[PDB]
Amino acid sequence: EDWIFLVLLGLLMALVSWVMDYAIAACLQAQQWMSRGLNTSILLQYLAWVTYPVVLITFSAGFTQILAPQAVGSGIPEMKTILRGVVLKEYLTLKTFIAKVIGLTCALGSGMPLGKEGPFVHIASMCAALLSKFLSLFGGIYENESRNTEMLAAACAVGVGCCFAAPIGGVLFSIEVTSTFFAVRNYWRGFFAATFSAFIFRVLAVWNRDEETITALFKTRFRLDFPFDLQELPAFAVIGIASGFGGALFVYLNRKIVQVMRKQKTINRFLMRKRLLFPALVTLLISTLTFPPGFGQFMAGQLSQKETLVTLFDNRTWVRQGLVEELEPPSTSQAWNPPRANVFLTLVIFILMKFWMSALATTIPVPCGAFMPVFVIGAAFGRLVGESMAAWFPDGIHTDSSTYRIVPGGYAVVGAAALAGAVTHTVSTAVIVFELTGQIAHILPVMIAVILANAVAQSLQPSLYDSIIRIKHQQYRVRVEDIMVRDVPHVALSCTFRDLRLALHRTKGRMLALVESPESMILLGSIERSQVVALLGAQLSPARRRQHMGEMSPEEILEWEEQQLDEPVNFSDCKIDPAPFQLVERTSLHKTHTIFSLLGVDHAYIVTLKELRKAIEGSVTA
Amino acid sequence: EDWIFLVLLGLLMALVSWVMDYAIAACLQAQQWMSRGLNTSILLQYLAWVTYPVVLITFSAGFTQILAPQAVGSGIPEMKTILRGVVLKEYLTLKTFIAKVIGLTCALGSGMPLGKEGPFVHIASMCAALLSKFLSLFGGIYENESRNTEMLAAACAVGVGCCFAAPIGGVLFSIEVTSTFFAVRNYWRGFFAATFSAFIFRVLAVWNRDEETITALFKTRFRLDFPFDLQELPAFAVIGIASGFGGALFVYLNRKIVQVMRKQKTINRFLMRKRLLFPALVTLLISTLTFPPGFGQFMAGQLSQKETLVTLFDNRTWVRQGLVEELEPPSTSQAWNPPRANVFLTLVIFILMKFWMSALATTIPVPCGAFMPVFVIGAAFGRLVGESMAAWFPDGIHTDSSTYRIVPGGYAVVGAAALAGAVTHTVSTAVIVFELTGQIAHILPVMIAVILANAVAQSLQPSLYDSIIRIKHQQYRVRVEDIMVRDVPHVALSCTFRDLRLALHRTKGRMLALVESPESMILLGSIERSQVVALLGAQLSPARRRQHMEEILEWEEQQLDEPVNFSDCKIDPAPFQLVERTSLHKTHTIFSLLGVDHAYIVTLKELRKAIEGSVTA
C-alpha cells in the first residue's frame, strides 16, 4: 500500500517537475529571442523587456487570486502548521493546485528572481493528498488521518528533493523546516519516494536529450587531489560569519517590508483597490533596473538564475583572463566583465542590488520561493571573496614545495551554502549544494561556513519561515486553574431531548459531556457529529418504524418526530476515538511545550486555547 | 554552556580517535614486521602469526573481564535502551571507559576482522557523561536528566561521525540506529560536535604527516564526467537485492551462533571454566586459515582491513593487468592475483570464507563492531560483480558513438554500501561511503542498491542490533485491565510515619501517593528522597530544643510530631501521563518518543511476558 503510493507520487512529481522546467525554459528562451530580435532600437527592446515580465506577473497574480487566493505565498509555514496539528483543509484542493502550478510557472518564466522550493513542496503535499483521496475510493484504509499526515510529511521531503534533484538534501531540508520531531519511518518513506522521483526526472531529462547522461545540474570541475589548503580555512570561516549577518539582515528587511505593506493605510487602500498594480509596478522597476544595455552592464542582467549560478561556479580566475583569452570560444563569464567596470566592482554592485531586489520580490502575492535568490546572492558573495583572495595571492598558496592556485568556485559554493543556511537555518544546504555541484572535495570549508552562519543567524534572528508565520525557573508561579469556569452543562441519563436541544441552541460548542450518572460521572466516550448523522440516516428505515410501532406545516412533522423520540441508541457500527489528550494541572510549562511540539494538539485536559494563547502573548511581548 | 560542551567533547574525541588509530597502526606494523622478519622458516612465521593475534585477543578479553565486564559487546543496543528511557548507570563509568578503550586497541591491533563503531560510540557516550559530571561541579544546571539524555544522543552522532570522519553520515547513522524520534535541536548539537570532531582529527592527521592535507580516508579516482551508463542501472540494482539477502542471511547466522553458544550446556560449562580459551581457540583457527603462504594466497591475507578496502576501491581493471604490467611499480592489487588462481576464484573464496569468519568473530566477548567486516565483504562482492561485468564487456558500453570502459571500483562501492545498509537497516550508509570515498559520481546507483537491499532485508530479517537486544485486526481485543490486581496500598494524610515505614518495608516502589482521605483520595503532593534527607538533617538540630527553655530509634519515635516544610528544595509533582484505552500504534510510538517504562500503578512486566509467550505457540 505505502510503497506503491510513494512510487506513484514520485512518478507524477518527476513528470510535473519536468514539464514545469520545460515550460519555464521555453518562456526564458522566448524572452531572450524577443530581446535579441528587437536590437534595432533600444526603445523597442526596453519596451519588450519591460512588458513581458509585467504581463506574466500580472497574469499569474490575477489567475491565483481569482482561482484560489490560498495559493499565494511560499506555503512552507502553512505545512508547518499542518504538521503541527492545525489542519487547513482549504489549502489541499484541485483548484489551488492548478492555480499554484500556473502561477509559479508564469513567475519563473517571467525572469523574476524567485524560487520554486516553496510552491513546489506545497504542490508535493497537495498531490500526495489528492492521490490519498484517489486511493480512498479503492479502499477506506487511507482514511486514517495519522497516515495522511505521514504521507504529507514524506511528500514534503519528496518535493524538496525533486526541486534540487537531491534526495538526501531535500529530505533533510524538509525535516529541518517542516518539523521538530521526525520519525525514521517517515524518513524512510520520504527518502525512498524522493529517490524514485529524482530517478524518473533524470531519466526524462536524458530522454529529452537535455542532459547527455544522468549527471549533476550544476557541474563543477575543481581539483580533487588538492581542492583547498589549511591556510584557506579561516577566511572561509569569515565567509560563513558575514553570510550569517547577510542572513540575519535579510530576514529583517523582508519582515519590515511586509509590515510597511501592512501597517500603511494608504498602501493597504491602494492594494484593495488596485491589487494588480503593485506587482506590475515592482516588475516595471526591476525590469528597468536590470535592463542589459542600461544598468545591466554592471550586473550581467542578460543571464537568468540558472546560467548565473553556473557562471558563479566557474573554476577559472577572471582577474587573470586578460592574457589567455585568445584560444577559447567566448564563454558566459564575459558577461561579468564590462570594459568600464572591474570584476570586483561588478560583484559588489550585483550583491548590493540583487539583495534588495530579492527582498522586495519575496513579498509579491505570487507563489514563489526564496532559497534560489539567496543561493545565487551567496554564490556571488563567495565568488567575490574568492576573486579577492586570488588577487591577494596571484600564484596561489605554497605548501610542501608545491604551489596551489586559488579556485574562486570553491569560495562561491562556500558562500552560497553558508548564506542559504543563514537565511533558512537548515543544515542540509551543504548537502544540497554538494549534490547539485557533484563534488564534495570542499566539504570541510562549506560545512564550517554553514555551521558558523547558522549559529550567528539563530543568535540574531529567527528563520524566514518563522517570520512569515508570525506576520501572516519562574514558570511554576503561573497557574491555569485561575481562569477555569465551574459552569458546565450536564446531561442526565434518563432525561428527554428537550434539555439537549435547549443546550444545543444555547451553547455553540462542538462537543457535549454525556455522563453515565450524576454521582459516579464516569464519561465512557465522546460522540461525533458524523456518528449522529449516520444514526439519523439509518434510523429512518421503514422496517424499524413498522416493527417498533402536500402543503402541511413542518411543525406537525417536527411534533411527530418529537413524539417518536423513545428509541434506543447504538454504538457498535461506527468508529470511536479512544484517545483524549493528557496533561496535569501542575505540569511544568517546559513539558507542556515539549508535548504540544511533539504532535500539535489544539486541545488539552474544559479549557480553551484562545485565552491561554492571549495570556502567553501578553507574557512574552512585555 | 551547550556549545562549549560540544567543542570540548569534539576535541577530546578527536584526540582519543587519533591516539587509537596511531596505536592500532603501530600494532599492525609490528605484526607485519614480525611476520616478515621470520621468513627464514615457515614454521616460525606460522608460530608468530598465530601467537600474536591470540596474545592480543586473550589480553583484551581478560582485561575487559577483570576491569568491567559491562564493556563486553558492541554497546549500540544498550545505548538505544538508554535513549528509550532505561537508564543503565553501570555502563557509563571510568572503569568501563578504560577497559573498552584498551580492549578496542588490542582487538583492532591483533588483525581481527572487527569494527569499532559500536564500542567507539559507547566511548562517546561515556566521555560525554564524564564531562557532564566533571563540569557539574562548576554548575548545577547539568544534573537535569533530560539535557543529559540530549547530550548522550548528540555524543552518539559524535562518535559515529568521528569513526568515519564523516560529519553528515555519522549523525544520520546515529539517528537511524539509536532512536526512532529525534529532535532537530539534538541533530544540531550532535552534528556541530561531530563536525568539530572531524575537523580536529583531520588537523591532527595533517600535523602528524599521516595525510598530506585534509582529505578523504578512502580516496577514489573514478571518472567525474561520465561515471556510469544507464545500461548499468539494472545490474547495480541486482547488486542491492542480493546484498539484501547477504544482509538478511548474515544477521541470521550470527543470531544462530550465539544461540548455539547459549543453548549448548557443555559449551557454556567450558565457558564458565575456561572463558579465556574460546577467544584463544577462535583466534588460532582464524590465524591458521588466514596464513598468507598457506590459504592466504587465495584470500590475500597479507592485507589488513584498511589496505584491503583501499585495494577493492581501485579504478583499474584487474582482469586486464596481464598486458600493461611493465611500466608501473608493484601495486597492492597484485596481492589479489596469485599465479595459480584467477581473480574471480580468489574473490569468491574471499567472500565465502570472510563471511563466516566475520559472523564468528562478531560473537567474541570483546568490544567490537560489525560495520567494518560487512563493508569489506560488500566491497569484495561489488568488486566481483564489476569484474564479471567488465569481462562480459571488455571494451565497455557504447553510448552516443563513444565507448566507456566499466570501472569495477564503482561496483565495489555500490556493493559495500548496499550490504552495509542491508545488515544495519540504515539508509545513511550511502553518505558514509560517499564521504569516505570523496566522490559522489555514482550517487544514484549507490542509493538504488542501498534502498533495495534495505527493503528486502527488512522484509526478511530484523536488524543486527535488534537481534543483539533480543538475544542479550484482533489486536484491539486484548486489553490491559485483565491483568491488574486491585489491591494497592494507600497512605492517608492524617496518618503517622509508622504506616509510612510499614508501606516502605512492604512495597519496594520508589514513590507513594499521599492522599488526603481514603474517600476523596486527592493526592496533594509527593515527597522526594531529598526532602526526606532534609527533614532528617533538620530533625537533629539542638538549637530548637535548647532555645525553647536502639535508643536513637526510640528518640526518633518520640520526635515524630514535627512540622514539614515545602519551600526550599524543588519538587516535580507531574509524572508521565497516558490513557488505558490508548491504541497500540500510538502506544508504540510514545514508548519510542522519549520512551517510557511505566504509565498510569500498572506494570508492563506481565504484558511483556505475554508477548514473549506468543512465539512458542
Side-chain angles (χ1 to χ4, degrees), chain A residues 351-460:
Chain A
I351 291 281
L352 292 204
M353 186 64 72
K354 274 299 296 280
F355 188 16
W356 71 248
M357 292 180 183
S358 306
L360 300 183
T362 312
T363 61
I364 301 299
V366 291
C368 56
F371 191 88
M372 281 325 317
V374 171
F375 202 94
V376 171
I377 193 66
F381 188 14
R383 188 62 181 203
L384 172 43
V385 176
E387 296 289 349
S388 300
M389 185 64 72
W392 292 353
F393 300 101
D395 278 293
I397 294 172
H398 62 280
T399 287
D400 293 10
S401 85
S402 285
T403 42
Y404 298 120
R405 314 281 198 91
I406 303 176
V407 179
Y411 293 60
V413 159
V414 166
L419 182 55
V423 167
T424 297
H425 312 347
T426 300
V427 183
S428 55
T429 58
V431 192
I432 302 140
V433 65
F434 283 16
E435 292 173 284
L436 288 162
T437 58
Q439 294 188 291
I440 62 170
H442 272 268
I443 172 167
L444 181 70
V446 172
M447 184 36 68
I448 297 169
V450 164
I451 301 299
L452 291 171
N454 204 337
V456 295
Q458 203 194 320
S459 67
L460 272 296

Side-chain angles (χ1 to χ4, degrees), chain A residues 176 180 183-185 187-188 191-192 195 212-213 224 226 427 434 438-440 443 447 578-579 582 584, chain B residues 176 180 182-184 187-188 191-192 212 224 226 427 434-435 438-440 444 447 451 577 579 581 585-586:
Chain A
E176 301 266 10
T180 79
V184 303
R185 185 174 65 182
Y187 177 81
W188 283 332
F191 182 76
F192 181 76
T195 300
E212 296 162 350
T213 58
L224 183 63
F226 293 99
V427 183
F434 283 16
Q439 294 188 291
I440 62 170
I443 172 167
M447 184 36 68
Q582 310 88 18
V584 185
Chain B
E176 301 275 9
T180 61
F182 207 79
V184 303
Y187 175 80
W188 289 338
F191 182 76
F192 183 112
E212 297 164 352
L224 269 192
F226 273 20
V427 171
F434 279 16
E435 292 172 284
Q439 297 189 292
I440 62 170
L444 178 70
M447 64 183 73
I451 60 147
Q577 308 88 18
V579 182
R581 322 277 200 181
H585 185 273
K586 54 173 91 153

Side-chain angles (χ1 to χ4, degrees), chain B residues 1-12 131 135 138 142 192-193:
Chain B
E1 288 196 58
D2 294 331
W3 303 97
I4 190 167
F5 168 89
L6 311 185
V7 167
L8 301 153
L9 183 63
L11 178 57
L12 282 71
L131 183 63
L135 71 83
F138 171 78
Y142 285 92
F192 183 112

